[PDB]
Design a protein around this ligand. Structure first.
Ligand code: ADP
Ligand code: ADP
Ligand code: MG
Ligand code: MG
Lengths: 565, 268, 28
């Protein structure tokens, strides 16, 4: 393979490549647009170290205090039935509804798996709402708290439109901490400085800034308290130990010294910047997603094309057949146009290729035993009936008497293609129940006579072995200038090898991409083994391909030549 | 620069057309002439006889006088692989350069599909080759004289619905047998062989057949497929005529010769 | 046609300078 080969393959498979790449890019774009945007807020913390302060910030002690302050164990999610309903609602300009809940106690099922009880709140109006946990409907109003069915819920300031549903989950305190800890990160940004860069990510831009402010203030209030804790424990035991009198006064001096030390012990933590949310989402990164969608779609399209190229075995040009020594007398293109093509569209590009076969045969059928031409092939639906019936039509217009014998006693349909008095075909003649004169019929828009197959016999291969078949050909060879015999494929049945004994010329029809070169070589050698000499081959169903133009010099399709009017 | 180079590098590795007559002769195809592009409904051999392309056609005229001897008849069929390869340009101008040498030449426009030679010579369009083959015209009523030419010509006539079947009529061989006695040379212009089969029918009655290959448009395999399609129909193609050659430095380095030809006149 | 982008610079004397860098680039 070389540059021309691969470029021709890419040009031929351009529909497949473009479709697969466009599907991948469409999926990438739909993900980049429908994925929930995740924002990031950051704050600045200065340490007067900062390595132990990092582990203290991410502790369940500090983070758990934020969950309690902001009620982060009350999870509220807008209800969208599909996995994309949230993304498309954002694209339609719909502002996401939000409800403020300050008190939530679910019945706490706490079953085998669902440790997170859930209810569904359906907004009815600006003031009242509905609740349904497991079908139990409960009506609630903003303000007045609800204590019914073992369900405590207090909804304040419903900011949404009627009809919107919301999934209200009461997740356990550790799950609320683990979710916060997963999106919350601490860094030093100088590795030596007392500066801590607290970042927090989330889908709600306002909420994550309130959370990171709570984490900072809790760690701030907590840190000052920690240094006092050594002196507070001393002060705690002193108060428990307050009951000779001179020592009692000495304890009073220690009593106030522990009070002042604890109060003034605020240090090691300074919040330089309060949390603000970056309005540009950090995820999804739309550009890298779409770019990967294009590149992944291309490499997938290329490996599929690379596979189909290395896996295909069918014929690509008549050169492949002629490398083996098979004469290709014509290459018939696919006619994009029960009709005879040579009659319906005589100017067709495929009929122009059959005329080139007509003149190639006039030179190849001379010096033959008789004027009988048998047309067979390797596989069914290769074009043996298309070519033989149209070849007979192009030879009939030249003023010759042509007989088309449909010797496909198994699946012959030439009578349907020519207009039929289906009675008394070739079967009825071979079985003795019809005369040779009663089976010949004229093609209406044709110019040649034809013998139909008749009724499908139970022994088609044994009927053709009857001496009547050679009598019909010997009789017809005197009343016609050419007899064209349509036969079944040789790699399916043996009928053509029986008929080919009485035909002076035999041609194989090879389908363009469906048949293989070895398949046609096996067919020609199966004929020769039965005493039938195949003159050559007819490549049928050729299509215009750029790969043939680069691999070989010619695509073998043919040119259109008419005056356009 | 790197974009210009990769585009040039692609066009070089992707092009398959003929680059020199050497490519055709590696396969065993005799190239009798290489006609350059004439940068100059007129006959080039008449409008500009000193043209570089007419000087190359004169070299074909003398190469044919030696190749057309020992032939069956004085009929020369000129065909090709693809349309617009220069078959009508070469055959009509070859007939003009042989007519000035004092010979009686007949140019038959046997392109019954898209023949325009009557437009190129000045036409009484009635009674062409079609009307003769269909029996509605005599052989004497179809021959017409090229005004600024020197040879007679037979136009295609009205476009028939069955051009390939008209040429199979025995009248066509009767016309050639009659014209082969009243003319020193008959040049038959035909459609391309890879388009239709008309040239393979006509080539049965022509003693000499030449293919015209377009310089960059046709491929070497395209011309080999054409010569073997003729031989399969009993037509022996004597050789090829490379047409439309342009001056290229790549040919001068790849092969020793660019095959374009030199200009030789006294400038006054 | 691209808009020309200029650059101004200043020199600051610090009596470290690693925590001073993060303080300069702060939103405060
Ligand atoms: N070159 C072609 N162009 C257009 N249609 C074709 C061509 N060859 C075959 N066909 C169509 O494909 C079908 C197969 O042809 P058929 O004669 O029934 O095959 P076979 O006899 O070899 O089994 C037919 O309907 C025919 O019209
Ligand atoms: N060597 C050439 N130099 C200049 N013009 C040319 C040359 N060959 C062909 N042409 C022009 O290109 C067109 C194609 O020629 P034409 O005879 O119509 O091609 P064909 O008969 O092979 O289909 C004509 O108009 C002709 O004048
Ligand atoms: Mg069939
Ligand atoms: Mg022409």
């Amino acid at each position: 393979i070389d540059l021309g080969r691969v470029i021709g393959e890419l040009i031929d498979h351009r529909k497949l490549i473009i479709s697969i790449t466009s599907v991948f890019t469409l999926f990438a774009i739909l993900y980049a647009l429908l994925a929930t945007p995740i924002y990031e807020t950051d704050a600045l913390i200065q340490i007067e170290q900062s390595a132990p302060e990092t582990a203290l910030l991410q502790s369940r002690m500090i983070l758990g205090k934020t969950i309690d302050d902001l009620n982060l164990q009350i999870q509220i999610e807008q209800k969208y039935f599909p996995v994309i309903g949230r993304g498309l609602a954002r694209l339609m300009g719909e502002k996401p509804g939000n409800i403020d809940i300050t008190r939530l106690y679910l019945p706490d099922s706490d079953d085998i798996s669902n440790n997170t009880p859930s209810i569904i709140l359906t907004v009815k109006d600006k003031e009242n709402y509905s609740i349904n946990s497991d079908g139990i409907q409960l009506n609630g109003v903003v303000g007045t708290l609800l204590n019914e069915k073992g369900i405590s819920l207090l909804v304040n300031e419903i900011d949404a439109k009627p009809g919107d549903q919301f999934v209200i989950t009461q997740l356990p305190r550790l799950k609320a901490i683990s979710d916060l800890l997963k999106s919350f990160s601490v860094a030093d940004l100088g590795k030596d400085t007392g500066m801590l860069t607290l970042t927090l990510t989330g889908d709600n831009p306002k909420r994550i800034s309130h959370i990171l402010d709570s984490i900072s203030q809790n760690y701030l209030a907590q840190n000052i308290a920690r240094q006092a804790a050594q002196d507070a424990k001393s002060l705690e035991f002193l108060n428990q130990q307050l009951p000779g009198r001179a020592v009692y006064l000495q304890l009073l001096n220690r009593q106030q010294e522990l009070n002042i030390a604890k109060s003034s012990a605020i240090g090691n933590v300074r919040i330089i910047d309060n949390a603000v949310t970056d309005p540009n989402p950090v995820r999804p990164k739309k550009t890298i997603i779409i770019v990967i969608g294009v590149v992944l779609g291309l490499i997938v399209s290329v490996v599929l094309v690379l596979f189909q190229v290395f896996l295909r075995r069918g014929i690509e040009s008549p050169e492949q057949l002629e490398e083996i020594g098979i004469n290709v007398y014509a290459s018939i293109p696919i006619s994009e146009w029960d009709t005879l093509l040579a009659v319906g569209n005589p100017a067709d590009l495929a009929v122009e290729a059959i005329r080139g076969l007509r003149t190639s045969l006039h030179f190849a059928m001379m010096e033959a035993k008789n004027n009988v031409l048998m047309i067979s092939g390797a596989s069914p639906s290769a074009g043996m009936t298309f070519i033989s019936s149209n070849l007979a039509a192009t030879i009939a217009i030249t003023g010759k008497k042509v007989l088309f014998i449909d010797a496909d006693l198994r699946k012959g349909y030439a009578h349907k293609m020519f207009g039929h008095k289906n009675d008394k075909g070739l079967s009825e003649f071979l079985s003795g129940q019809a005369a040779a004169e009663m089976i010949i019929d004229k093609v209406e828009g044709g110019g040649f006579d034809y013998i139909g197959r008749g009724q499908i016999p139970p022994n088609p291969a044994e009927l053709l072995m009857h001496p009547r078949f050679e009598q019909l050909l010997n009789w017809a060879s005197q009343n016609y200038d050419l007899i064209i015999i349509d036969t079944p494929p040789i790699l399916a049945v043996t009928d053509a090898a029986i008929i080919g004994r009485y035909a002076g010329t035999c041609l194989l029809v090879a389908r363009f991409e469906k048949n293989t070169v070895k398949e046609i070589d096996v067919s020609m050698k199966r004929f020769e083994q039965s005493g039938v000499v195949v003159k050559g081959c007819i490549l049928n169903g050729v299509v215009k391909k750029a790969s043939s133009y680069y691999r070989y010099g010619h695509n073998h399709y043919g040119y259109s030549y008419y005056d356009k009017k």
